[PDB]
């Protein structure tokens, strides 16, 4: 079932934390911290 284990250390946590970076993956071209690191 779902009962008492850690539910914030699941799929639930890796997938939010996935398209968390995805928007400035795309939103990093404007500065483009490959070539700029300051």
Same mark, same amino acid.
């Given at each position: /079932?779902?009962? +008492?284990?850690? +539910?914030?250390? $699941?799929?639930? @946590? /890796? ?6 970076? &995805?928007? $400035?993956? %795309? @939103? /990093? /071209?404007?500065?483009? %911290?490959?070539? &700029?690191? +300051?």
């Amino acid at each position: /079932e779902a009962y +008492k284990k850690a +539910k914030q250390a $699941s799929q639930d @946590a /890796e997938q939010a934390a996935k398209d968390a970076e &995805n928007a $400035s993956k %795309e @939103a /990093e /071209e404007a500065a483009k %911290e490959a070539v &700029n690191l +300051k």
